[PDB]
Amino acid sequence: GVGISTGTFNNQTEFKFLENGWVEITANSSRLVHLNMPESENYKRVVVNNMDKTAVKGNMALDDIHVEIVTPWSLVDANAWGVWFNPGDWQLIVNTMSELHLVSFEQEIFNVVLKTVSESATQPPTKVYNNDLTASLMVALDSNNTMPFTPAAMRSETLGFYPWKPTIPTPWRYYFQWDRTLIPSHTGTSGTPTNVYHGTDPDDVQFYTIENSVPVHLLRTGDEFATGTFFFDCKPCRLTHTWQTNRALGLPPFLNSLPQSEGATNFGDIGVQQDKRRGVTQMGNTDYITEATIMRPAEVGYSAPYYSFEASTQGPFKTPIAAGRGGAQTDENQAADGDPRYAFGRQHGQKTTTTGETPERFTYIAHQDTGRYPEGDWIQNINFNLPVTNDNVLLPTDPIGGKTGINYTNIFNTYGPLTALNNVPPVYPNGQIWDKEFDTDLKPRLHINAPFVCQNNCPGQLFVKVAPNLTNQYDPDASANMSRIVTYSDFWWKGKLVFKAKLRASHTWNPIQQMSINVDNQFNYVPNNIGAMKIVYEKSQLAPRKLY
Amino acid sequence: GVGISTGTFNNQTEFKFLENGWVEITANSSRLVHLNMPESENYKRVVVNNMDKTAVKGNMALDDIHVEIVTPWSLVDANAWGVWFNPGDWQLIVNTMSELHLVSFEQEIFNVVLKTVSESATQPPTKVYNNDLTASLMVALDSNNTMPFTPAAMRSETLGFYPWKPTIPTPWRYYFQWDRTLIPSHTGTSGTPTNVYHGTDPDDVQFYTIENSVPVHLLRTGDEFATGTFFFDCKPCRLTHTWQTNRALGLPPFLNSLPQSEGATNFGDIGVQQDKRRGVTQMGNTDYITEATIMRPAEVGYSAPYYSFEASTQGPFKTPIAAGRGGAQTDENQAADGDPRYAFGRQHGQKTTTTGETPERFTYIAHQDTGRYPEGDWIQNINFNLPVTNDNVLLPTDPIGGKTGINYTNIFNTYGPLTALNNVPPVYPNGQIWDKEFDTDLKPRLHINAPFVCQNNCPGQLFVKVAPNLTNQYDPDASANMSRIVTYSDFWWKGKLVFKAKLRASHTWNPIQQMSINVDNQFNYVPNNIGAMKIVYEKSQLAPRKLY
Amino acid sequence: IGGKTGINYTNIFNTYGPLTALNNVPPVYPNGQIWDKEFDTDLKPRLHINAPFVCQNNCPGQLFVKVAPNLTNQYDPDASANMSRIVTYSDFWWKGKLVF
Amino acid sequence: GVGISTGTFNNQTEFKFLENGWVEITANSSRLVHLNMPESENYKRVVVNNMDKTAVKGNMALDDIHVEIVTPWSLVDANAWGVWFNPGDWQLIVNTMSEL
Amino acid sequence: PAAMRSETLGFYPWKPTIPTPWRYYFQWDRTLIPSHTGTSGTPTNVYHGTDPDDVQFYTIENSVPVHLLRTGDEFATGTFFFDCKPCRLTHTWQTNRALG
Amino acid sequence: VGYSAPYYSFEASTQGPFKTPIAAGRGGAQTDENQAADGDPRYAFGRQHG
Amino acid sequence: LPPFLNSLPQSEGATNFGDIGVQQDKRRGVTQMGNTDYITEATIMRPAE
Numbered sequence A, B: 001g002v003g004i005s006t007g008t009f010n011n012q013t014e015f016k017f018l019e020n021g022w023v024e025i026t027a028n029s030s031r032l033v034h035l036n037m038p039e040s041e042n043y044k045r046v047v048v049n050n051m052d053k054t055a056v057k058g059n060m061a062l063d064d065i066h067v068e069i070v071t072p073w074s075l076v077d078a079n080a081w082g083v084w085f086n087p088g089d090w091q092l093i094v095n096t097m098s099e100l101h102l103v104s105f106e107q108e109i110f111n112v113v114l115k116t117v118s119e120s121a122t123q124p125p126t127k128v129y130n131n132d133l134t135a136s137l138m139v140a141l142d143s144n145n146t147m148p149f150t151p152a153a154m155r156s157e158t159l160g161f162y163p164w165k166p167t168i169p170t171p172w173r174y175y176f177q178w179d180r181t182l183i184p185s186h187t188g189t190s191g192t193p194t195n196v197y198h199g200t201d202p203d204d205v206q207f208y209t210i211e212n213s214v215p216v217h218l219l220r221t222g223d224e225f226a227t228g229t230f231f232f233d234c235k236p237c238r239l240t241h242t243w244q245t246n247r248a249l250g251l252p253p254f255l256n257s258l259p260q261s262e263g264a265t266n267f268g269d270i271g272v273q274q275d276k277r278r279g280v281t282q283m284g285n286t287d288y289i290t291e292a293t294i295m296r297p298a299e300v301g302y303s304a305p306y307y308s309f310e311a312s313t314q315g316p317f318k319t320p321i322a323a324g325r326g327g328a329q330t331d332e333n334q335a336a337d338g339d340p341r342y343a344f345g346r347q348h349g350q351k352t353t354t355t356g357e358t359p360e361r362f363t364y365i366a367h368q369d370t371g372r373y374p375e376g377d378w379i380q381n382i383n384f385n386l387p388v389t390n391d392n393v394l395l396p397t398d399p400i401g402g403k404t405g406i407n408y409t410n411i412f413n414t415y416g417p418l419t420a421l422n423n424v425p426p427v428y429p430n431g432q433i434w435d436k437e438f439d440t441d442l443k444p445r446l447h448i449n450a451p452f453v454c455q456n457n458c459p460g461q462l463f464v465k466v467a468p469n470l471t472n473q474y475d476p477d478a479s480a481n482m483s484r485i486v487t488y489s490d491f492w493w494k495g496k497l498v499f500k501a502k503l504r505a506s507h508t509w510n511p512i513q514q515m516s517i518n519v520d521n522q523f524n525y526v527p528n529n530i531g532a533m534k535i536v537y538e539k540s541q542l543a544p545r546k547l548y
Numbered sequence C: 001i002g003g004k005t006g007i008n009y010t011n012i013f014n015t016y017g018p019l020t021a022l023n024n025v026p027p028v029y030p031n032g033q034i035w036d037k038e039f040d041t042d043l044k045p046r047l048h049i050n051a052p053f054v055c056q057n058n059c060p061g062q063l064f065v066k067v068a069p070n071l072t073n074q075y076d077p078d079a080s081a082n083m084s085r086i087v088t089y090s091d092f093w094w095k096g097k098l099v100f
Numbered sequence D: 001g002v003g004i005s006t007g008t009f010n011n012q013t014e015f016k017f018l019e020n021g022w023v024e025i026t027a028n029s030s031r032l033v034h035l036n037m038p039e040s041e042n043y044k045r046v047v048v049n050n051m052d053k054t055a056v057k058g059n060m061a062l063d064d065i066h067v068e069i070v071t072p073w074s075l076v077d078a079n080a081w082g083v084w085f086n087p088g089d090w091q092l093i094v095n096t097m098s099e100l
Numbered sequence E: 001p002a003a004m005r006s007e008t009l010g011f012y013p014w015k016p017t018i019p020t021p022w023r024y025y026f027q028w029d030r031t032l033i034p035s036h037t038g039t040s041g042t043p044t045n046v047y048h049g050t051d052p053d054d055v056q057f058y059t060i061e062n063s064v065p066v067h068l069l070r071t072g073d074e075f076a077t078g079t080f081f082f083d084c085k086p087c088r089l090t091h092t093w094q095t096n097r098a099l100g
Numbered sequence F: 001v002g003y004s005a006p007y008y009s010f011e012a013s014t015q016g017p018f019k020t021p022i023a024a025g026r027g028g029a030q031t032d033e034n035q036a037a038d039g040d041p042r043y044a045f046g047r048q049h050g
Numbered sequence G: 001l002p003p004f005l006n007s008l009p010q011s012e013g014a015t016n017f018g019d020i021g022v023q024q025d026k027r028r029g030v031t032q033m034g035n036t037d038y039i040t041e042a043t044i045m046r047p048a049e
């Protein structure tokens, strides 16, 4: 069955409006995937050790040592917003929907092709491509999620974002266990710290093979493969942001004195002595009821140690932070509430005609005011007693450990039973969409990498690979490296991701932040005279929501 | 029945999504109307003659002479976009709908109040307001459209645009017939032209009375009045604009030479001698097939005389133009394709805290490229024969009538059996919504004032008036002026205007013009520290549409 | 800590973890709030510090009251002024029923 | 309809005992509310800035700057224990109930 | 929540009360750097204003149907049902030192 | 049972500084507190509410 | 997804390492560090912690 197609290209996003303001978004994405023969046919256990870098005192954070199993299989990952929606669709969703529901996912492989390269070793010399009709492409869909979960978006290795531009999958590899020690130090530290990779703990070894745990399918041109329809189990993702802070929760103080003339100088006045006011407070000493002192239900947001690194059996790792805005606009603390920074290129944004190999990037800065501005933090001695005396105040300025560039905010953590928090907002187009939950007894309240964490079950991973096209000479009983015909494959991938949205309703007199084409962004949405493209990142939760 | 309310306030806009991308927009608008006793109780036939102005040679266009019947009735007009939608709703409609259908209209008057002013003529002296419970408000709804149609939007006299700000109706008046002569002249004209108002032609007299042709209703506090539901008969209004011109219709010439390197200098080249090309043309002489010479199906747009005034029995009037863009952006000809200019204030936009009495205004400039740029026009002698010789070219520069500031474009008119044209686009918020068709045997292809022209039938006009609150002294047999108690009324008006929209679909790779809040417009959508408001005009058909 | 005399580790300290057992805020008579609307964040807080009852999926809506504009015979929309209106005030009885 | 009342005053707390030691507390609260005309009829967007206080080094905690929308509406809030129970009821609940 | 600022209805059945003028937070960017009495220079105390992408002007008239009541009229809410966890009226005294 | 959290900690974000909330009860003798440490609430009111 | 190794070992030996083959400031990927352009195994983004 060579002369018949086995599939259809479809990259349309359908918006189906239902009853009561609910829409059913059907994002169709098709892509032509190009796939090469594995450079090797065996699994390799490789160690990566860049001690040359960590050898330099004060370079701990640049540690890359790990051990990974290198498989002869490739992963077809489509878990990233850019694969399903273009700037247009996205603007539609973000400007009018109030919440998003991830419903189901299904993919299929069709119109498979396998060619053989022949070196017409004459003159230049030449190269001749031919069809190997009876050759097969191997396909394995790990439904049971036996294999380790490895999101390609984490390393900008998902399918590309352009319907009219071929793409490729990524060689699949996964972490193996290993013990590693690396002691912190600074430029002036003495002696040689302790930078040792101890190896692997036998009680943590887990060598996985696809061949042994997932049925594999062989497809020839005539064949096709389709996944079933997987249904997610995730909480809805909101498309609105909160702006309220503790300072803006509840009943404002009653102004006894109101401005009588226009002018951004004419303020209103509470009109009551800060120690002669009524209200509630959690400060049993003073009688000062102040906007920064009065009681509030709980606490929106929280403080966590910044540029903290922790260490365990495998080595050091940065301490993650779940947090939004908190601070002026061109007045951040990227570190404090962890604004994510995305590095990618060409195939996932970055102008296409770009040269060199320096990735493009951006630091996403959410609209939700749930972050913190450390410099504003301070601490006072129980006696209160203002103006506070230097001996009774710890400030983001006073040093810690005699260190000049470290202070309590750095060590600080105000997470507790009163912490109100929100989930990570979606990041177009470089963000991951869904993520598999940790199989720990107690799970995390959220994941920092994706807004959708399928709990009870997630779509399995799809592995692809060109099956061994051997030559007439092959001897198992001789390490050699099995000479095999240079074969490559081309197939089309088609996926269908279904969402369920809820149309928003206005509730204020005033208009609202809406995504829109300007005379400034204009050319970020259209190709140029050479056909170069790029996909600029966009914000998602533009639109306020009352928090309390 | 004085202690019971007879109505409900509702100013919500409901968007109900149906099957197949059709939405049903229900715009609810409520308003508190304040109404005063008529200054007179009789109809007056008044003549307006500003000959003092037209006396000055060269001031013909400033002619205001007319005759009108002044009625003791007031008109409650709500026919203007600003009454039904706020910036928010409007942004929603304009950014996502592709077409609009005007479905039905219904209004109602409730919670009527009538008070009596008493001058406590003591010291300052004082004023005392009292309720005249048994007094009546007169209401007349001209269902049959017996009365002359008089759109208040034409003179910025519709109900106000703010739900939380009381409004008032306009004294109703209508044109009476009259013969008037005014001969054109210029500063240097000699003698005294001819500026004569001849009066009225008995065969054109039509004195209308509401009392004689429309049943009138008397409402006391306990009463209420509601219109039925009127259903319109109008063509759908489109919310997209065309950009194609004759120069961009059909198959472009095939470029034999394409640019080989980036750069807005590297052009492509047709590659064929303009007199050696194949194609069709309407120029039987030359063999020049040129982008400006090749044939096109018909003609988008048309040329019409600009700053033309015509005259008939009543006097002079400007010749109307139905036309869009046509020309660069900051490169118009406001006159040529008649861009409308709206003058209004306070109650219908204009910052509320504004002083003085100079109206606010703007000239609406549509996105549809259906206008003309005269300077580009020219005319050639039949022989063609280029480069064209001055003696065979009439240019927008050569004079006409020996006049230096007049040329053929000024006199020009290229309307014909091949003219393709579009209807007037909606103008928020100062634009009129629907308009009653002319009862002429042959009707106009469009109206320049509103996008919706109810043909077979339109909602009738609503007239309101305080009924005569007489005093104990009244003598019919004595002209006097009937002394009557100073009475005024307050009532609530509620209307419901139902539209039917169609959701748009993207069909291009590129994004699209969308309405949106900027750091520049921001404060045009929110009140200030004094509570001042204003409603900035917006465009409607932002979004391209293929014309051919 | 930080060479500061009035600051020490307890001040910076945080021992919250996967083994923390905790209770909710206790009711405070008579000045305490009774119920509170939950934060609409993806991940919510284990408790609210202000009330012992946090209605999650839904809470009673807020009740807003206001005297409607009692205008005088003189009112002109087209003039910022400040709309002179009759001095009016209102008195009404409120009755609520809270079932535990 | 001016000469007819439209409601009843009730500020009784009813304790209804059921089967298996469960009681159903019905707290009734009635109140006469007095309400004045708004000082203004428009919404105002006002900024509050007490820099004069935060200007003084070491006074960070006394920061009050914020922006609020001032509405011509009033809120009728009853969410606070004191509105529903008196010392007596409260003593009853607190001394004998184990959960609410 | 008005309880946050002691602005709920009053606590005495036999004493008239009043509601509170409703107001709500608007978005704004503000910087204030910590300092102590002996800090040098002038820290950084700046109110940058509002971020357009966080603006949300709410109006009651535009989002909630309003009712007009005259003496003859009355208004009643429906019965709202809460969804909250039970609140306990007992306290724990055990500490880690007294477990087991 | 219970946990330790930074006391008289202020954090900052887009809007400005705010005190870090604490969810905690007793812990310590009677006339032997640390009002700050486990955040005992303080209520200010008057006339109409006490 | 581990970084793609442009340079792989060609002979056995626990010394023969593979090499990413791209300048740490010339790589593509995502990061939560809005300042630098350094995408590093200890710097690149991860879902959570």
Ligand SMILES: [Ca+2]
Pocket: A324, A325, A326, A327, A331, A332, A333, A334, A337, A339, A371
């Ligand atoms: Ca930040």
Ligand SMILES: [Ca+2]
Pocket: B324, B325, B326, B327, B331, B332, B333, B334, B337, B339, B371
């Ligand atoms: Ca023009």
Ligand SMILES: [Ca+2]
Pocket: B243, B325, B367, B368, B369
């Ligand atoms: Ca144009």
Ligand SMILES: [Ca+2]
Pocket: A243, A325, A367, A368, A369, E027, E028, E051, E054, F014
């Ligand atoms: Ca903000």
Ligand SMILES: [Ca+2]
Pocket: F025, F026, F027, F028, F032, F033, F034, F035, F038, F040
């Ligand atoms: Ca304590």
